[PDB]
PDB file of C-alpha atoms in Angstrom:
ATOM      1  CA  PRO R   1    -167.772-113.047 103.335  1.00 39.83           C
ATOM      2  CA  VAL R   2    -171.462-112.038 103.133  1.00 36.65           C
ATOM      3  CA  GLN R   3    -173.009-111.451  99.669  1.00 36.66           C
ATOM      4  CA  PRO R   4    -174.635-107.941  99.583  1.00 34.99           C
ATOM      5  CA  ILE R   5    -177.057-109.154  96.809  1.00 34.51           C
ATOM      6  CA  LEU R   6    -178.906-111.235  99.537  1.00 34.52           C
ATOM      7  CA  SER R   7    -180.579-107.876 100.501  1.00 33.82           C
ATOM      8  CA  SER R   8    -182.031-107.554  96.931  1.00 35.72           C
ATOM      9  CA  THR R   9    -170.468 -79.219  92.056  1.00 34.46           C
ATOM     10  CA  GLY R  10    -167.456 -77.222  90.769  1.00 33.80           C
ATOM     11  CA  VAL R  11    -164.562 -78.551  88.631  1.00 33.98           C
ATOM     12  CA  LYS R  12    -161.400 -78.344  90.811  1.00 35.00           C
ATOM     13  CA  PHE R  13    -158.916 -80.096  88.441  1.00 36.39           C
ATOM     14  CA  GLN R  14    -157.867 -79.892  84.745  1.00 34.07           C
ATOM     15  CA  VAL R  15    -155.968 -82.356  82.430  1.00 34.58           C
ATOM     16  CA  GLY R  16    -152.283 -82.337  83.463  1.00 34.37           C
ATOM     17  CA  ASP R  17    -152.922 -81.333  87.114  1.00 34.13           C
ATOM     18  CA  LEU R  18    -150.903 -83.310  89.707  1.00 31.74           C
ATOM     19  CA  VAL R  19    -153.049 -85.188  92.238  1.00 32.74           C
ATOM     20  CA  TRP R  20    -153.045 -87.825  95.023  1.00 31.98           C
ATOM     21  CA  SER R  21    -155.543 -90.667  94.409  1.00 31.13           C
ATOM     22  CA  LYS R  22    -156.889 -93.422  96.693  1.00 28.80           C
ATOM     23  CA  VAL R  23    -157.922 -96.457  94.546  1.00 30.29           C
ATOM     24  CA  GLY R  24    -158.953 -99.827  96.094  1.00 29.45           C
ATOM     25  CA  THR R  25    -156.462-100.976  98.780  1.00 28.49           C
ATOM     26  CA  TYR R  26    -153.536 -99.045  97.196  1.00 27.10           C
ATOM     27  CA  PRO R  27    -152.053 -96.212  99.340  1.00 29.36           C
ATOM     28  CA  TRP R  28    -152.418 -92.529  98.274  1.00 32.14           C
ATOM     29  CA  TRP R  29    -150.803 -92.653  94.809  1.00 32.79           C
ATOM     30  CA  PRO R  30    -149.137 -89.838  92.777  1.00 33.89           C
ATOM     31  CA  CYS R  31    -151.372 -89.285  89.708  1.00 32.59           C
ATOM     32  CA  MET R  32    -152.082 -86.934  86.803  1.00 33.81           C
ATOM     33  CA  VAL R  33    -155.602 -85.831  85.799  1.00 33.49           C
ATOM     34  CA  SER R  34    -156.231 -87.015  82.227  1.00 34.92           C
ATOM     35  CA  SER R  35    -159.053 -87.537  79.703  1.00 38.21           C
ATOM     36  CA  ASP R  36    -160.609 -91.012  79.326  1.00 40.17           C
ATOM     37  CA  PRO R  37    -159.668 -92.322  75.801  1.00 38.61           C
ATOM     38  CA  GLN R  38    -163.156 -93.853  75.226  1.00 39.26           C
ATOM     39  CA  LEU R  39    -165.363 -91.143  76.861  1.00 38.18           C
ATOM     40  CA  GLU R  40    -163.122 -88.122  75.859  1.00 37.79           C
ATOM     41  CA  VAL R  41    -163.774 -86.503  79.306  1.00 36.42           C
ATOM     42  CA  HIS R  42    -161.560 -85.910  82.381  1.00 35.82           C
ATOM     43  CA  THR R  43    -164.546 -85.271  84.709  1.00 34.88           C
ATOM     44  CA  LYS R  44    -168.173 -86.502  85.055  1.00 35.24           C
ATOM     45  CA  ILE R  45    -171.182 -86.510  87.428  1.00 34.92           C
ATOM     46  CA  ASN R  46    -172.383 -89.750  89.182  1.00 32.89           C
ATOM     47  CA  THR R  47    -176.020 -90.984  89.115  1.00 36.17           C
ATOM     48  CA  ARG R  48    -176.003 -89.650  92.770  1.00 36.39           C
ATOM     49  CA  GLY R  49    -174.752 -86.166  91.705  1.00 38.57           C
ATOM     50  CA  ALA R  50    -171.103 -86.456  92.885  1.00 38.12           C
ATOM     51  CA  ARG R  51    -168.131 -85.309  90.737  1.00 34.89           C
ATOM     52  CA  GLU R  52    -165.565 -87.874  89.483  1.00 33.01           C
ATOM     53  CA  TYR R  53    -162.098 -87.435  87.926  1.00 36.08           C
ATOM     54  CA  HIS R  54    -160.238 -89.685  85.501  1.00 34.41           C
ATOM     55  CA  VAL R  55    -156.613 -90.104  86.725  1.00 32.81           C
ATOM     56  CA  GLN R  56    -153.511 -91.861  85.340  1.00 31.43           C
ATOM     57  CA  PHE R  57    -150.997 -93.362  87.801  1.00 27.00           C
ATOM     58  CA  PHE R  58    -147.311 -92.395  87.889  1.00 29.49           C
ATOM     59  CA  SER R  59    -145.768 -95.943  87.850  1.00 29.08           C
ATOM     60  CA  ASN R  60    -144.106 -98.487  85.490  1.00 31.83           C
ATOM     61  CA  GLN R  61    -147.725 -99.822  85.106  1.00 32.12           C
ATOM     62  CA  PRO R  62    -150.343 -98.219  82.739  1.00 33.52           C
ATOM     63  CA  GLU R  63    -152.837 -97.845  85.609  1.00 33.57           C
ATOM     64  CA  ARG R  64    -155.856 -95.537  85.220  1.00 35.04           C
ATOM     65  CA  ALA R  65    -159.135 -95.084  87.162  1.00 35.90           C
ATOM     66  CA  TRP R  66    -162.292 -92.925  87.552  1.00 35.48           C
ATOM     67  CA  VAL R  67    -161.893 -91.603  91.136  1.00 35.21           C
ATOM     68  CA  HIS R  68    -164.527 -89.847  93.355  1.00 32.11           C
ATOM     69  CA  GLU R  69    -163.774 -86.139  94.225  1.00 32.14           C
ATOM     70  CA  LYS R  70    -163.311 -87.060  97.976  1.00 31.08           C
ATOM     71  CA  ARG R  71    -160.433 -89.426  96.983  1.00 32.08           C
ATOM     72  CA  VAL R  72    -158.699 -86.823  94.707  1.00 33.15           C
ATOM     73  CA  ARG R  73    -156.407 -84.301  96.510  1.00 34.20           C
ATOM     74  CA  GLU R  74    -153.961 -81.643  95.174  1.00 33.22           C
ATOM     75  CA  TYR R  75    -150.281 -82.777  94.890  1.00 31.78           C
ATOM     76  CA  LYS R  76    -148.039 -80.133  96.517  1.00 29.26           C
ATOM     77  CA  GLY R  77    -145.101 -82.474  97.315  1.00 33.96           C
ATOM     78  CA  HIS R  78    -144.188 -86.077  98.334  1.00 35.10           C
ATOM     79  CA  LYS R  79    -143.989 -85.164 102.126  1.00 39.30           C
ATOM     80  CA  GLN R  80    -147.791 -84.429 101.910  1.00 42.37           C
ATOM     81  CA  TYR R  81    -148.278 -88.257 102.067  1.00 41.31           C
ATOM     82  CA  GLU R  82    -147.655 -88.234 105.862  1.00 37.84           C
ATOM     83  CA  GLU R  83    -150.621 -85.794 106.284  1.00 37.85           C
ATOM     84  CA  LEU R  84    -152.814 -88.183 104.175  1.00 39.62           C
ATOM     85  CA  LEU R  85    -151.663 -91.212 106.261  1.00 36.57           C
ATOM     86  CA  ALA R  86    -152.435 -89.169 109.459  1.00 37.14           C
ATOM     87  CA  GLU R  87    -156.024 -88.651 108.149  1.00 35.37           C
ATOM     88  CA  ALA R  88    -156.517 -92.465 107.894  1.00 34.65           C
ATOM     89  CA  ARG R  89    -147.396-103.106 101.127  1.00 33.28           C
ATOM     90  CA  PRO R  90    -145.936-105.678  98.628  1.00 33.93           C
ATOM     91  CA  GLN R  91    -142.276-105.078  97.545  1.00 34.65           C
ATOM     92  CA  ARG R  92    -143.216-104.826  93.794  1.00 33.19           C
ATOM     93  CA  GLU R  93    -145.927-102.227  94.624  1.00 31.78           C
ATOM     94  CA  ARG R  94    -143.585-100.124  96.883  1.00 32.12           C
ATOM     95  CA  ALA R  95    -141.017-100.020  94.031  1.00 34.12           C
ATOM     96  CA  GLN R  96    -143.665 -98.737  91.535  1.00 32.48           C
ATOM     97  CA  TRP R  97    -144.821 -96.115  94.149  1.00 32.99           C
ATOM     98  CA  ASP R  98    -141.164 -94.896  94.504  1.00 32.14           C
ATOM     99  CA  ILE R  99    -140.889 -94.657  90.648  1.00 30.28           C
ATOM    100  CA  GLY R 100    -144.200 -92.727  90.748  1.00 34.31           C
ATOM    101  CA  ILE R 101    -142.967 -90.249  93.413  1.00 35.71           C
ATOM    102  CA  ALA R 102    -139.688 -89.747  91.427  1.00 32.83           C
ATOM    103  CA  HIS R 103    -141.635 -88.671  88.291  1.00 33.74           C
ATOM    104  CA  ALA R 104    -144.327 -86.656  90.200  1.00 30.62           C
ATOM    105  CA  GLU R 105    -141.532 -84.583  91.870  1.00 33.49           C
ATOM    106  CA  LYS R 106    -140.057 -83.958  88.363  1.00 31.13           C
ATOM    107  CA  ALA R 107    -143.569 -83.016  87.037  1.00 30.54           C
ATOM    108  CA  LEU R 108    -143.988 -80.393  89.858  1.00 28.13           C
ATOM    109  CA  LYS R 109    -140.990 -78.526  88.299  1.00 31.13           C
ATOM    110  CA  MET R 110    -142.871 -78.504  84.920  1.00 31.03           C
ATOM    111  CA  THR R 111    -145.926 -76.516  83.801  1.00 32.59           C
ATOM    112  CA  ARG R 112    -149.322 -78.306  83.291  1.00 30.83           C
ATOM    113  CA  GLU R 113    -148.874 -78.064  79.466  1.00 31.68           C
ATOM    114  CA  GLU R 114    -145.344 -79.615  79.717  1.00 32.52           C
ATOM    115  CA  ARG R 115    -146.645 -82.444  82.023  1.00 34.46           C
ATOM    116  CA  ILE R 116    -149.269 -83.443  79.360  1.00 36.44           C
ATOM    117  CA  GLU R 117    -146.609 -83.626  76.549  1.00 37.69           C
ATOM    118  CA  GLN R 118    -144.255 -85.808  78.677  1.00 37.91           C
ATOM    119  CA  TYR R 119    -146.529 -88.052  80.815  1.00 36.90           C
ATOM    120  CA  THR R 120    -149.908 -88.534  78.957  1.00 38.11           C
ATOM    121  CA  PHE R 121    -150.553 -92.297  78.408  1.00 39.46           C
ATOM    122  CA  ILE R 122    -150.160 -93.785  74.909  1.00 39.84           C
ATOM    123  CA  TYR R 123    -153.401 -95.473  73.712  1.00 38.14           C
ATOM    124  CA  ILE R 124    -153.469 -97.957  70.774  1.00 36.14           C
TER     125      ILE R 124
END
């Protein structure tokens, strides 16, 4: 542990699109592109000029994050995970990933419009 402070583009995805997202130390997670409830945007540009996407996790958890374009890939099927692991977990986390994959595979059978109506997060 060393304190770092001691030293001191086209839109590819729309709301409802199925994606793979890499957030923190989580593995590639099945997600849906959605609009941020506060910002009312699904995509934005960094102070460095890079594109970012707001994604909601397929899980039993209401997980959401603003992910960099390099960590957002198209979801074509659950077997695509092996390709993502080739490019490069707790029991409770593996169970929520399996629940995620189960619903993402169901969402692939639906249209983008249908995915929004069934899986968009409830905000209060």
